[PDB]
Ligand binder design. Structure first.
Ligand SMILES: *[C@@H]1O[C@H](CO[C@@H]2O[C@@H](C)[C@@H](O)[C@@H](O)[C@@H]2O)[C@@H](O[C@@H]2O[C@H](CO)[C@@H](O)[C@H](O)[C@H]2NC(C)=O)[C@H](O)[C@H]1NC(C)=O
Ligand SMILES: Nc1ccn([C@@H]2O[C@H](COP(=O)(O)OP(=O)(O)OP(=O)(O)O)[C@@H](O)[C@H]2O)c(=O)n1
Ligand SMILES: Nc1ccn([C@@H]2O[C@H](COP(=O)(O)OP(=O)(O)OP(=O)(O)O)[C@@H](O)[C@H]2O)c(=O)n1
Ligand SMILES: *[C@@H]1O[C@H](CO)[C@@H](O[C@@H]2O[C@H](CO)[C@@H](O)[C@H](O)[C@H]2NC(C)=O)[C@H](O)[C@H]1NC(C)=O
Ligand SMILES: *[C@@H]1O[C@H](CO)[C@@H](O[C@@H]2O[C@H](CO)[C@@H](O)[C@H](O)[C@H]2NC(C)=O)[C@H](O)[C@H]1NC(C)=O
Ligand SMILES: *[C@@H]1O[C@H](CO)[C@@H](O[C@@H]2O[C@H](CO)[C@@H](O)[C@H](O)[C@H]2NC(C)=O)[C@H](O)[C@H]1NC(C)=O
Ligand SMILES: *[C@@H]1O[C@H](CO)[C@@H](O[C@@H]2O[C@H](CO)[C@@H](O)[C@H](O)[C@H]2NC(C)=O)[C@H](O)[C@H]1NC(C)=O
Ligand SMILES: *[C@@H]1O[C@H](CO)[C@@H](O[C@@H]2O[C@H](CO)[C@@H](O)[C@H](O)[C@H]2NC(C)=O)[C@H](O)[C@H]1NC(C)=O
Ligand SMILES: *[C@@H]1O[C@H](CO)[C@@H](O[C@@H]2O[C@H](CO)[C@@H](O)[C@H](O)[C@H]2NC(C)=O)[C@H](O)[C@H]1NC(C)=O
Ligand SMILES: *[C@@H]1O[C@H](CO)[C@@H](O)[C@H](O)[C@H]1NC(C)=O
Lengths: 290, 279
């Protein structure tokens, strides 16, 4: 039914690249930051600052981790409840490169969401929420094990979006310096990029207060993927085919009611992505996989 | 009739303390006494809490114990009791050779009562949380910097390994100091796991809390480097000793047992515990 329109997709890539230098904006690099440089936050008051230490700099890549990288079929996996029961895991995993959002869980869910991960996003506040600030031996071990399971994937850490990341960022940095060379995970650390990314989408008449992580990943993926397939983008509380109630996340327990805690216009994002699907720019999966 | 110093009895106390506690060593970790990546535990929290020593933390440690071979005649140890308000003890405190203060307590607006001389002040890392907004803004960073600058060459004695609640803020503090290396004259000191060692002297004096206070820890340190110790601001009650009218807990707003023993030591002439207006 859906048919890829490569030429229209590549036009979109070029338009994105006119506003966002994706390869550079993907991560700060060692030679682009000074020790002691003061960072501000994309989404908080200008008064919040964060000084880049020697140790932080030592974790930056030398070159962009996506410099001269090319993947034919990419999956970008959002976290919608539409994925529960979809059995999309095999198809997702056939992709050359899989992007995941907010360190989402795969363990109990691989039949639906897959096991392949080539990039996952990681707000430093994950450490506060799920790893008790790496205070104890058990917390440190649990975090280490989570990282080891990612193997050589990219861990894409936006430490300069929300000022609430600041104190936990030092804990994350210190963990990684301490464990230097024990993990194969590739660290990537975007700087202040959301002004650039917002400019592309504003011209397409999408101007929320904040773009979602999913659409940010689409944006990055456009530069290095030949063809993008979206899964788990469905910001609604019912299944479009069966009409059954859905939770917000695929990992929510069965029966959880749909709720949004927004700063996002997800339905506005979805509408535009769905238009793009119709134009053949990208494939939005909204049904069980075959 | 007046308190009189009993120098013989104090010299016996100093010797007993030294025979139970290596004060010069316990005073601070040093660069060569820790290894990068060593896991520290906390004296007063469960064993499960750990903090890994970084290159940067190690870089802030002194090479040699800052109190090695130091000897001062008259020391004041100033606790933070409200009993100091209206005491007019500032001049007498400041006449001391060396003044120890507690928890970075303010002096500027209180100098008539508490003095302005400071040679050592302690600093629980949580001070950053409570008074400096975790150094989140330029204004906070500037305010902390200015506070530090006013200490000039005094020791800042930072116990980061007593309470596990110090862990996250300690990295903020370390990063601040590394970022400002060479801009401040303050001398940093970082005691390690010392409370079990300090405790051993005080346990024999039948002082038996779970945790000894900063004030009595300061007395212990002071015994090694002072000829004579005078205490101010030790009065752990919300009420005036003479009048029983409300008194704030701090002049700038376990302990009763510590106070009782310090009072006994005063009576023995080991130390002078001031509880009244100074002349
Ligand atoms: C890059 O991928 C394209 C597209 O592959 C197809 O669509 C994918 C989503 C997935 O379903 C694939 O298995 C499909 O083959 C490749 O183009 C196809 O190449 C095959 C085999 O050579 C050919 O029979 C098809 O006609 C082509 N399909 C289209 C739409 O062109 C392309 O070969 C891939 N290139 C590399 C180097 O991997
Ligand atoms: N029902 C849902 C839930 C999520 N998403 C998409 O999947 C991404 C990842 O979801 P989630 O981890 O829940 O992100 P949020 O917590 O919604 O927040 P943010 O986008 O700010 O990271 C979102 O950015 C959004 O694009 C969606 O389309 N429909
Ligand atoms: N009313 C008071 C207040 C303080 N103190 C003494 O002054 C020291 C410093 O006081 P404070 O800054 O209040 O210490 P705390 O923060 O209460 O806790 P800690 O004693 O653990 O530093 C205390 O250790 C205590 O010995 C006192 O005797 N009477
Ligand atoms: C792929 O998409 C492009 C871009 O929209 C299509 O090219 C357009 O075709 C429409 C419909 O006839 C024309 O009105 C436009 O003028 C064309 N624009 C450009 C820039 O070429 C193209 O038809 C699509 N391909 C397929 C197979 O649908
Ligand atoms: C993100 O990419 C943008 C370009 O889209 C970068 O902005 C450009 O940076 C160079 C400085 O070397 C200037 O020559 C251009 O004028 C800038 N363009 C615009 C539109 O401002 C930006 O530096 C990148 N940011 C990061 C953190 O990588
Ligand atoms: C994307 O990540 C996956 C792992 O999630 C990589 O696939 C693994 O590759 C290793 C090393 O060759 C194999 O031993 C594993 O069996 C593979 N696992 C899975 C789940 O497929 C894959 O190479 C990565 N792709 C890149 C980097 O392009
Ligand atoms: C100074 O303190 C010492 C030590 O406590 C006092 O000497 C003791 O005095 C008592 C009472 O006379 C004797 O029973 C002990 O045998 C003494 N011990 C020693 C080691 O001398 C001394 O009297 C104090 N000086 C005063 C009160 O002026
Ligand atoms: C504080 O001083 C005490 C000695 O009073 C040190 O305790 C000794 O530590 C060594 C090495 O850990 C042990 O082998 C000895 O048995 C200990 N002696 C005693 C009497 O317990 C302690 O290491 C010092 N701690 C710090 C952090 O300086
Ligand atoms: C104890 O600390 C005080 C500072 O609080 C030192 O006194 C200062 O000494 C400097 C340098 O000579 C003078 O410029 C200041 O006027 C003095 N200030 C005060 C308040 O007296 C004092 O030297 C220190 N004592 C020791 C023994 O280190
Ligand atoms: C020490 O202080 C005492 C008490 O005022 C004084 O008598 C003595 O001369 C001082 N100086 C020295 C070097 O002992």
């Amino acid at each position: 039914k859906w048919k890829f329109n490569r030429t229209a997709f590549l036009h979109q890539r070029q338009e994105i690249l006119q506003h966002v230098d994706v390869i550079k904006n993907f991560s700060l690099t060692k030679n682009s930051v000074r020790i002691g440089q003061l960072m501000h936050y994309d989404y908080s008051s200008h008064k919040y600052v964060f000084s880049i230490s020697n140790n932080f700099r030592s974790l930056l890549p030398d070159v962009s981790p996506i410099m001269n990288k090319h993947y034919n079929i990419c999956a970008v996996v959002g976290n919608s409840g539409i994925l529960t029961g979809s059995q999309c895991g095999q198809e997702i995993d056939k992709s050359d490169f899989v992007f995941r959002c907010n360190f989402a869980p795969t363990e109990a869910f691989q039949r639906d969401v897959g096991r392949k991960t080539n990039l996952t996003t990681f707000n430093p506040s994950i450490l506060e929420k799920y790893y008790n600030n790496l205070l104890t031996i058990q917390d440190r071990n649990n975090f280490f094990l989570s990282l080891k399971k990612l193997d050589g994937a990219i861990l894409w850490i936006p430490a300069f979006f929300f000022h609430t990341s600041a104190t936990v960022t030092r804990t994350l940095v210190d963990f990684f310096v301490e464990h230097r060379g024990q993990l194969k995970v590739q660290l990537a650390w975007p700087g202040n990029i959301m002004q650039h990314v917002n400019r592309y989408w504003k011209n397409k008449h999408l101007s929320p207060k904040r773009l979602s992580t999913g659409i940010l990943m689409y944006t990055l993926a456009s530069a290095i993927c030949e063809e993008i397939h979206l899964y788990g983008f469905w910001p609604f509380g019912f299944d479009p085919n069966t009409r059954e109630d859905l939770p917000y996340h695929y990992y929510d327990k069965k029966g959880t009611k749909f709720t949004t805690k927004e700063s996002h216009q997800l339905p506005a994002e979805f509408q535009l992505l769905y238009r793009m699907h119709g134009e053949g720019l990208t494939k939005l999966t909204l049904s069980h996989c075959a």
